[PDB]
């Protein structure tokens, strides 16, 4: 007998995100200090074409445009990042009001409009000042971060009930420090997994500060995921042991770093053992990394993933990367940022942080696609391959939902095409366009379908 | 808007991909059976050892062509084969298997066509220096007279080299194909004796007036400017050096083979960067000049395109990266792009003389899955031939000169350095049992053969 399917669950907060270096511009204004990105992109030969955030969407001005299309679209939630330079300009000291200001009238005007406000307190944009004396290399950083934390969380509580700490420490620390293709543009292992343990003191330093002062908000992080398949199993062919076990030591790279000290309180030991035994990370350092966040672990409200794509990769002796393997490009479809299109592995993914961690609601707090979006003659955005990408994802997640997962919420990426950081204005990933030229707003028939989507769905 | 009458409609095999019986009947060692018998060479540690054993199985093979309809089937002659040490003594039993093999197919009404050389080079030449040697040039001529004088009258269509830029820089610059060789200056070398033996053997076959046409397949990939694509202004530098990378993989091959020279703008920039000796690249045009004679037609392997633009920091000779465009991509990471082929196709018969082209390859790698009914349900290969046929189609509307088109592949086989990981086939084999089960895209392309002639 047909019982009513399992539906997103009321209540369910179905939103868009952004991040304030990849929209706001408006970068030496009202007394902003400069950040990482500022120094990033005014660089030569780190962004493609030469782009950078100076005017972005121009959102600083023109937000209550952008607070009106959200509730046009029937937004239940957004999320944004604060500009820790527009607070604290050299990120500690005199605190900077007229930052408070944008944000008090960014947030005040969400709620009148009856958005949910949920704040990434850090997404990439350290003050450079900060910067100058080491970043998130220097262990002094923990403390200025939460002294900024606590001062909008104590600011903006009666408004913003939920807080997320870092978006992506995996980025943060492996493309801002290792690859350098992020800023600040460093190039050093062994201070990319400083810069992880600096991240994660960090995190538990607010969520400890929030329920020891009893302050009525949820806290979490934002991880990115990618869950990882053996092209070996793909061919139907036998596994070896070296195999699976330099696989799964690259999975946990990607994630299990940060999962595992958030969600346990520890670091994946045999990560840990490997990167000392291949002499990338120093043996104290692992030691007392992995005592550090035992001390200082507490469990977060909610735990935020950002998910586009899967990995397949197999072994590879020859290979130049920190693991013997290489990728594999399975046959499908793919994005502008050639990443496949693969909705199954959001189900999994869910359905692994279900089996494999505690219970916590979840949020996908970035899930969406890059198309090379064309305008027509009639002014519209006919982007059928990204309302496929959306349908199919939230169908998966649907599924999980079915399968018990406790998911709270999903934010698309983006609510309006942006600041893609090394790649530029280069990737679209709007559900809004934005025409850089005249800033003009144009709604995908991705914004359409979304509407209508939420209508159904809440 | 149709096919020209006697289109020839084929699929194309290359023997060390299918043959197998590796070291039988006195074959001499390729630089393919030594590659592959080297650790960490190959994907999974695959060999060509026994491949599809269609040595043995041939006959079977010939009837699925048959009944495929195939108007042309397209295979190489492994030179070890026939000179085991690459000269000296000819062995007969490998003449004895491409008599046999070239009888089957006429008596079944499938024109064979002649790959003379498909990369599997002789290891007793490869010791002496392979193609790096001039002397190559002459034990390649003789191997390829022979068995041009003793099939003529069966064999009307030879390539003198499949994808000459691969043997070069795959096998002696990159060293991901056999011999493994890296070093660019010896590709530029190797470059250079693959075209003047080209030439010999259209020079021989002209000058003793041998009723069969000499022709050469290059791969070809269609060069296409991300900033085009994003709609932005092109600066001159990245038009300049995109431009140098797709000539690198377009028109070093195509201008010496259609215009008997190399190009010069690349040839400046390879001295410039101390790729090539300025010796070299002053007797390099000479010679091509001197021995250039233009062939009966061009054999073109078609895939995909490539996107690219300018990157300042790049590790690449040239400066620049690749961008992947959003769509469908196959199991090599290749985009479905059947537009490349009309675009290449217009832009060879507006930019050379006029000359027939065949598509000598085209297709598609799957993870095709044999179901529990025996069959494989390869949609995906079936919409990509059918697009790129489409394309072809579009460019004899457009008044190119294509006379003919053959799918890689026939069977599914051994993928080089991929080893077996990947199925280009319409014909799918079971490695284990050798069983060959007709793909969906079998039936497809039967249809669209018997449709379209
Ligand atoms: O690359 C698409 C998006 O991926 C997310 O993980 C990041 O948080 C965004 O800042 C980025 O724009
Ligand atoms: O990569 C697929 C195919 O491409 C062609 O260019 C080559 O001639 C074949 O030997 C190869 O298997
Ligand atoms: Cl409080």
Same mark, same amino acid.
């Given at each position: 007998?047909?019982?009513?399917?399992?539906?997103?669950?009321?209540? /369910?907060?179905?939103?868009?995100?952004? *991040?304030?270096?990849?929209?706001?511009?408006?970068?030496?204004?009202?007394?902003?200090?400069?950040?990482?990105?500022?120094?990033?992109?005014?660089?030569?030969?780190?962004? &493609?074409?030469?782009?950078?955030?100076?005017? *972005?969407? +121009? !959102?600083? !001005?023109?937000?209550?445009?952008?607070?009106? &299309?959200?509730?046009?679209?029937?937004?239940?939630?957004?999320? =944004?990042?604060?500009?820790?330079?527009?607070?604290?300009?050299?990120?500690?000291?005199?605190?900077?009001?007229?930052?408070?200001?944008?944000?008090?009238?960014?947030?005040?005007?969400? $709620?009148?409009?009856?958005?949910? @406000?949920?704040?990434?307190?850090?997404?990439?944009?350290?003050?450079?000042?900060?910067?100058?004396?080491?970043?998130?290399?220097?262990?002094?950083?923990?403390?200025? #971060? /939460?002294?900024?934390?606590?001062?909008?969380?104590?600011?903006?509580?009666?408004? $913003?009930?939920?807080?997320?700490?870092?978006?992506? @420490?995996?980025?943060?620390?492996? %493309?801002?420090?290792?690859?350098?293709?992020?800023?600040?543009?460093?190039?050093?292992?062994?201070?990319?997994?400083?810069?992880?343990?600096?991240?994660? %003191?960090?995190?538990?330093?607010?969520?400890?500060?929030?329920?020891?002062?009893?302050? +009525?908000?949820?806290?979490?992080?934002?991880?990115?995921?990618?869950?990882?398949? &053996?092209?070996?199993?793909? %061919?139907?062919?036998?596994?070896?042991?070296?195999?699976?076990?330099?696989?799964?030591?690259?999975?946990?790279?990607?994630?299990?770093?940060?999962?595992?000290?958030?969600?346990?309180?520890? #670091?994946?030991?045999?990560?840990?053992?490997?990167?000392?035994?291949?002499?990338?990370?120093?043996?104290?350092?692992?030691?007392?990394?992995?005592?550090?966040?035992?001390?200082?672990?507490? /469990?977060? +409200?909610?735990?935020?993933?950002?998910?586009?794509?899967?990995?397949?990769?197999? #072994?590879?002796?020859?290979?130049?990367?920190?693991?013997?393997?290489?990728?594999? !490009?399975?046959?499908?479809?793919?994005?502008?940022?050639?990443?496949?299109?693969?909705?199954?592995?959001?189900?999994?993914?869910?359905?692994?942080?279900?089996?494999?961690?505690?219970?916590?609601?979840?949020?996908?707090?970035?899930?969406?696609?890059?198309?090379?979006?064309?305008?027509?003659?009639?002014?519209?955005?006919?982007?059928?391959?990204?309302?496929?990408?959306?349908?199919?994802? =939230?169908?998966?997640?649907?599924? *999980?939902?079915?399968?018990?997962?406790?998911?709270?919420?999903?934010? $698309?990426?983006?609510?309006? +095409?942006? =600041?893609?950081?090394?790649?530029?204005?280069?990737?679209?990933?709007?559900?809004?366009?934005?025409?850089?030229?005249?800033?003009?707003?144009?709604?995908?028939?991705? =914004?359409?379908?979304?509407?209508?989507?939420?209508?159904?769905?809440?």
């Amino acid at each position: 007998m047909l019982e009513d399917p399992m539906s997103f669950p009321k209540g /369910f907060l179905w939103g868009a995100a952004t *991040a304030s270096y990849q929209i706001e511009g408006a970068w030496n204004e009202d007394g902003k200090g400069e950040s990482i990105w500022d120094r990033f992109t005014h660089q030569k030969r780190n962004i &493609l074409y030469g782009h950078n955030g100076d005017v *972005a969407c +121009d !959102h600083y !001005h023109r937000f209550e445009e952008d607070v009106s &299309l959200m509730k046009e679209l029937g937004l239940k939630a957004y999320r =944004f990042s604060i500009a820790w330079t527009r607070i604290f300009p050299d990120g500690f000291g005199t605190v900077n009001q007229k930052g408070l200001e944008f944000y008090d009238r960014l947030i005040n005007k969400l $709620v009148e409009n009856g958005i949910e @406000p949920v704040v990434t307190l850090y997404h990439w944009d350290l003050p450079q000042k900060l910067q100058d004396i080491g970043g998130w290399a220097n262990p002094e950083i923990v403390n200025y #971060y /939460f002294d900024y934390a606590m001062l909008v969380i104590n600011r903006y509580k009666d408004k $913003v009930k939920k807080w997320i700490t870092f978006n992506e @420490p995996y980025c943060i620390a492996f %493309l801002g420090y290792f690859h350098g293709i992020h800023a600040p543009g460093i190039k050093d292992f062994k201070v990319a997994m400083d810069v992880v343990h600096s991240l994660m %003191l960090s995190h538990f330093k607010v969520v400890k500060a929030v329920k020891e002062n009893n302050i +009525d908000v949820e806290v979490g992080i934002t991880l990115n995921l990618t869950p990882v398949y &053996l092209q070996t199993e793909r %061919l139907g062919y036998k596994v070896s042991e070296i195999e699976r076990e330099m696989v799964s030591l690259s999975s946990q790279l990607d994630n299990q770093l940060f999962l595992d000290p958030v969600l346990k309180g520890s #670091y994946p030991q045999k990560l840990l053992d490997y990167l000392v035994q291949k002499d990338l990370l120093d043996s104290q350092k692992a030691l007392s990394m992995q005592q550090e966040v035992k001390e200082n672990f507490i /469990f977060p +409200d909610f735990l935020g993933i950002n998910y586009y794509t899967r990995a397949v990769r197999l #072994y590879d002796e020859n290979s130049s990367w920190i693991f013997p393997i290489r990728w594999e !490009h399975p046959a499908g479809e793919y994005t502008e940022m050639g990443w496949e299109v693969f909705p199954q592995g959001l189900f999994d993914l869910l359905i692994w942080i279900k089996e494999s961690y505690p219970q916590i609601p979840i949020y996908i707090t970035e899930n969406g696609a890059a198309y090379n979006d064309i305008v027509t003659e009639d002014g519209k955005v006919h982007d059928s391959k990204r309302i496929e990408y959306l349908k199919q994802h =939230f169908e998966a997640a649907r599924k *999980a939902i079915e399968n018990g997962v406790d998911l709270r919420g999903y934010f $698309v990426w983006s609510l309006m +095409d942006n =600041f893609e950081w090394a790649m530029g204005y280069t990737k679209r990933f709007g559900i809004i366009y934005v025409d850089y030229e005249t800033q003009k707003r144009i709604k995908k028939d991705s =914004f359409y379908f979304y509407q209508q989507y939420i209508k159904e769905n809440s």
